[PDB]
Design a binder for this molecule. Structure first.
Ligand code: 36R
Length: 337
């Protein structure tokens, strides 16, 4: 019941606990699941003090319970107190994943074969996600869990949103942030993130590691070159245009110069994913159908969602608490309807 001076309390079903790390709002352990007779991961989540924590928790739970896909982490079980007032923590049980792409990239240079199949698995999961009209919004190496080269699962849907092109209208990770987000809710933002992930696999370093959002745009233009007038016009803001229109002119760095050892087909796909103008950026199905992925592409083995997803939110943390209580009742004794 105790791990490192803190209560876990997932028993009696989950025992033989072993600390593995920290997450958003609490520790993560591996545990022995006595029912399924296998070790699992359990995240302890304590979001109730802060409204935003409650939002991400509710969002991730609602989405993950509805998605069912081999490249997306599932939720196996949810532990919580019998009464709301007693509910201070939520324990989310999921398949144990050995590591993630962020940890992996710190220790290994990936072969072209491994990059190719990792990329396929990411886009296969993304295809399902986008077919449900959902945007992940925070794709990055630490959100790609791994057991082996053939076993990748996208995780952390705490920031996911239903796609909504007309909106307008908390941030997603700067280095993986699409230029349109900084310059003015579309599927294209996830494709950009995946492109940053592909570039990172090719060289073991973030392609665009900006310090702040203007520095981020600077890194992007530093490689793609100064934006064209056509791409410049499609900026709903003034700043940009003006404001850079206001900086030195920059030429496009050729991808093969930036990545001299990379497969030319990988670089061709990378080029389509990392295009400034989101309207011209490659879409998920197109990316799966790219020659780089032709040895894997198989629409008959690439499930999509049954029904498009529909859940807005400026709700106080007390109303969200009840909603988390409702979504998790499923896993309680005596649940009906
Ligand atoms: N599913 C899952 N497996 C995990 C393993 C670690 Cl080390 C951390 C978080 C995890 O989440």
């Amino acid at each position: 019941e105790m791990v490192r001076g803190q209560v876990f309390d997932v028993g009696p079903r989950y025992t033989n606990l072993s600390y593995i790390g920290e997450g958003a709002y609490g520790m993560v352990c591996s545990a022995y699941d006595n029912v399924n007779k296998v070790r699992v991961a359990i995240k302890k989540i304590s979001p109730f003090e802060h409204q935003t924590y409650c939002q991400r928790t509710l969002r991730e739970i609602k989405i993950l319970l509805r998605f069912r896909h081999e490249n997306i982490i599932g939720i196996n079980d949810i532990i919580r107190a019998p009464t709301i007032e007693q509910m201070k923590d939520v324990y989310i049980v999921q398949d144990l994943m050995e590591t993630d792409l962020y940890k992996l990239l710190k220790t290994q240079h990936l072969s072209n074969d491994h990059i190719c199949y990792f990329l396929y698995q990411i886009l296969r999961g993304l295809k399902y996600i986008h077919s449900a009209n959902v945007l992940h919004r925070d794709l990055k190496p630490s959100n790609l869990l791994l057991n082996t080269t053939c076993d990748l699962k996208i995780c952390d849907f705490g920031l996911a949103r239903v796609a909504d092109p007309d909106h307008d209208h908390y941030v997603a990770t700067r280095w993986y942030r699409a230029p349109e987000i900084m310059l003015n809710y579309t599927k294209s933002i996830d494709i950009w993130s995946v492109g940053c992930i592909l570039a990172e696999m090719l060289s073991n370093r973030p392609i665009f590691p900006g310090k702040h959002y203007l520095d981020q745009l600077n890194h992007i233009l530093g490689i793609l070159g100064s934006p064209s007038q056509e791409d410049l016009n499609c900026i709903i803001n003034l700043k940009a245009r003006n404001y850079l229109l206001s900086l030195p002119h920059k030429n496009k760095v050729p991808w093969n110069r930036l990545f001299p050892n990379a497969d030319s087909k990988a670089l061709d796909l990378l080029d389509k994913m990392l295009t400034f103008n989101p309207h011209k950026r490659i879409e998920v199905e197109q990316a799966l159908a790219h020659p780089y992925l032709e040895q894997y592409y198989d629409p008959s083995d690439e499930p999509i969602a049954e029904a498009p997803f529909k859940f807005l939110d400026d709700l106080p943390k007390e109303k969200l608490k009840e909603l988390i209580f409702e979504e998790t009742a499923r896993f309680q004794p005596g649940y009906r309807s």
